[PDB]
Symmetry: C3
Subunit: 210 residues, 3 copies
């Protein structure tokens, strides 16, 4: 439990964590430690020091910066709130290759992966993930803890509800609103508004029931 000072604590030790650790390192940040619900190790050289019960200990020793590297949107949002209650600040992990327009408003805890572009006047909620290669055109609104998967793309003026997930290569045409907790499958091309809490798949994307 002997750590260096000044680095970032990561919640989560999975594949998403690996990519986040490397984004932070590419920016010259140090990653201090991981907390993982499997408390057994290291992820890309970063020690796993315990489960979330280790958070108070980490804060006590002076570490105060944290990122939640958990892909699950509702779990990520809960763990973000837990981290803030424990006195951590949620950093953003923005790969140096990402292009984020100067008029974009970013929340906290946001992952913006390599190859991303986000254009003018888009707003990105806390704990959003904008994954590898994704594109966000002008005037989009991304709600807290939503996830745009790798190689997905939003055309202009799209709104994505809290905790919504767009799978790899999903596309949304201009002006469309997607509700909270909605899942667009890989490749789905969304051509009309989607309400909350549905799954939509296909070209064009259609809602799938039971």
């Amino acid at each position: 439990a002997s750590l260096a000072i000044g680095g970032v604590v990561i919640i989560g030790g999975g594949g998403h964590a690996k990519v986040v650790i490397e984004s932070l390192r590419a920016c010259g940040e140090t990653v201090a430690a991981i907390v993982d619900a499997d408390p057994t190790r290291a992820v890309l050289g970063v020690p796993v020091v315990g489960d979330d019960l280790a958070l108070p200990m980490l804060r006590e020793q002076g570490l105060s910066r944290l990122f939640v590297a958990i892909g699950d949107n509702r779990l990520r949002q809960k763990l973000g709130r837990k981290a803030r209650d424990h006195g951590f600040s949620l950093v953003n992990a923005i790969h140096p290759s990402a292009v984020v327009s100067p008029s974009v408003r970013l929340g906290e805890g946001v992952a913006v992966m390599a190859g991303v572009a986000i254009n003018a006047d888009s707003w990105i909620g806390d704990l959003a993930i904008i994954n590898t290669g994704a594109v966000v055109d002008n005037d989009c609104r991304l709600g807290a803890a939503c996830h745009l998967g790798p190689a997905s793309a939003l055309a202009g003026g799209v709104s994505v509800g809290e905790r919504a997930f767009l799978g790899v290569g999903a596309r949304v045409i201009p002006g469309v609103t997607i509700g909270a907790d909605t899942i667009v499958g890989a490749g789905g091309v969304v051509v009309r508004d989607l309400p909350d809490s549905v799954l939509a798949i296909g070209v064009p994307a259609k809602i799938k029931g039971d």
Copy 2:
């Protein structure tokens, strides 16, 4: 109507203008003023000085560089010709992150957005838009005033007619020719030549009549 000297005049004050203004600024250019058919303001800090009737006044005061930031392809092409008749030179707006091969031939008035790649020996007509994240592989020919939408991709040796539009995430396989004034819907994957003036949608893209 008091402007600085030396900057670029933009025709159009919408979302496409915002992204173009930011591309020009990212290259260290200054944007002088906007002319918009709604002559009422500012777009990202750039004053709207009037409608197109203000063009002669702008030229008289020494401004001579212009970009047409209008997404509509036929309107953009008409306004490009109007600007040149009024003594403006059409600049290109190429985001610093775009990768444009040294053997690509670029026209004038061309937008090439963040994250774009254009590979060897492609030719890009005047007033084309190559939007955010789009890919153009080797030996493509893009006609004047066509538009490749965000995250679209052309494989090698594709020809795109004048004023044709490919929606977000559209894909075209090698060797395909797309006629002038043709629209490929978002996500459409074009696997055979398309004639002029049709709409094609789907995977694979199929022509849609009335």
Copy 3:
């Protein structure tokens, strides 16, 4: 047959060669010569000196670095082995804009084109092509001589067999394995494992027989 010393020999003189030559040049490498089965010229200024029968002559004159710029996967793999038997080392051609994570394992003879991202702990076999704009998320395994076409994307933990080909804009969801010698058509979205030697097309991708 008078060449400079120190440059890279390219097998293949087609469109893929053009893009590879430009990637090598963008890194400050010199391309010495091309060998092409049509021995008649130059490709982007690089002389075509003969067919593969010229390889021994090139090695004798001190050239020892080679890239196989042939899109055909089985032919590329055969010509890679021929080049190594003739005493050449297979270089990699990685465009300066590509983002290749520090924990990625690269083979030899690999093309990684402009705009590519490859994330943590992916392994890339000899003679793979990762084409323009393609994305490879964490923990992927790309077999020797496979080809990810332009704008294609693999989500995390995907395995792609030897000589498999994914067409422009193909997508594969997490955890999927694709067999050797399998072809995914342009735009195909692969949602379950594919065996060896099939063709799969569509959203979702389905195997097509005769």
